[PDB]
Paper text:
However, [name] lacks a consensus sequence for the serpin reactive center region and exhibits no antiprotease activity, while being a major neurotrophic factor in the retina that promotes neurogenesis and enhances the viability of photoreceptors, amacrine cells, and other neurons. [name] acts through the interaction with cell surface receptors, mainly [name]-R, which contribute significantly to the survival of retinal cells.
To identify all the zinc coordination sites, we next crystallized [name] in the presence of this metal and collected X-ray diffraction data. Importantly, all identified sites were located at the intermolecular interfaces and included coordinators from two or three protein molecules confirming the role of zinc as a promoter of [name] oligomerization observed in DLS studies. The type 1 site, which was also predicted by ZincBind appears to be the strongest and most important, and its occupancy seems to affect the properties of [name] at low zinc concentrations. Indeed, [name]-R binding and neurotrophic activity of [name] have been shown to be provided by its 44-mer fragment spanning amino acid residues at positions 78–12170,83–85. According to our structural analysis, zinc binding to sites of types 1, 4 and 5 results in this fragment localizing at the intermolecular interface of the resulting dimer/trimer, impeding its access to the receptor. Zinc concentration corresponding to filling the high-affinity site in [name] (4 μM) matches the level of elevated zinc in AH of some patients with POAG (2–7 μM), suggesting that this metal is unlikely to bind to [name] under normal conditions (0.4–0.5 μM Zn2+) but may be captured under pathologic conditions.
Numbering used by the authors: 35 to 372, 379 to 418
Amino acid sequence: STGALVEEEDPFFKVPVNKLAAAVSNFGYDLYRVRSSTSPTTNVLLSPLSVATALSALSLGAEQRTESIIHRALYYDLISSPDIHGTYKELLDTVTAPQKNLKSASRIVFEKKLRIKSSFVAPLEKSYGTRPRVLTGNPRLDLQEINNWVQAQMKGKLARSTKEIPDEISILLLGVAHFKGQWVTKFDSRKTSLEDFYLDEERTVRVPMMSDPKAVLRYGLDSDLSCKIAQLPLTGSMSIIFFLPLKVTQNLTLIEESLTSEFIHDIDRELKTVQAVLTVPKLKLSYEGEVTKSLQEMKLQSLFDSPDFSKITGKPIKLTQVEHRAGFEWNEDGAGTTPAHLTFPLDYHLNQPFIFVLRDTDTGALLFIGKILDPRGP
Ligand SMILES: [Zn+2]
């Protein structure tokens, strides 16, 4: 009984920037689901906000039908906003503020010699703080310039791309993000040690495992999903929510099917503070790849056929590539250290495949999502 335009009753989602954050985050969970389906045996690491942002910005140059196609994928058609792009600037300003430890940037890149209308550039730069790049047609220079842009946006925290530049670009969208933050409570690195990680029912590896035997966290068991949910706070009003299956498995699909902005808000409200025997693997992960094909499965295929971008230029152009680069890291770093007496202990050992969601507490925005089949790497 959903899909109708109704007034928002949930207080957290009445806030326009939170309503927008929930919309583009729901695009991000959609993209995550497609990628995870495509990658049943490899880690999935995504920061889809940078991709949603490139698409939202590009929709400024779309005529009405194409614009609506982009807006439907971003869930804008369920918002009743007079200023979607003004709200977006606020969203971006909030989640990339310095305390968030999150670098995120989106770029629109056009085929060589394209003449761009200043009536596109002006709202693009105002709301998204970005300017379109027109390629030169020299593959070496063009790849060097894009990597130099990623380097400056990410302050060198991502690896430069040794990937060849695509041969036939009309519109290329680039979404890049890096996150390395600090826990509210540091892990004692003296307690970090090599421990078993159950890749699956038959394969066990040894991985640097952080440990807090007396962790305070927020926790809840979701019986319907057979998974233990824990939330660990980060400095700068963010948290990581973990989804830990009860049985060793790489099949997280049932959990993945539930991931929406509204589900995650509900989970967050329902978690309760407990003490836990907590283990968390160290993570230093990176991803570089094209999400072109995944977006084509997300009702965006017509952007690649004959879309109408005549608000950008008179020359017929179309989406040809959407690139994502992401880097993500967590270690023991944190801001601080911490006749009967009864406790309620729980174990929370992330020593088997799990999903994590890095969420902004203020807006609820999805900042990063990982399916971690193997904490060592790809
Ligand atoms: Zn609520």
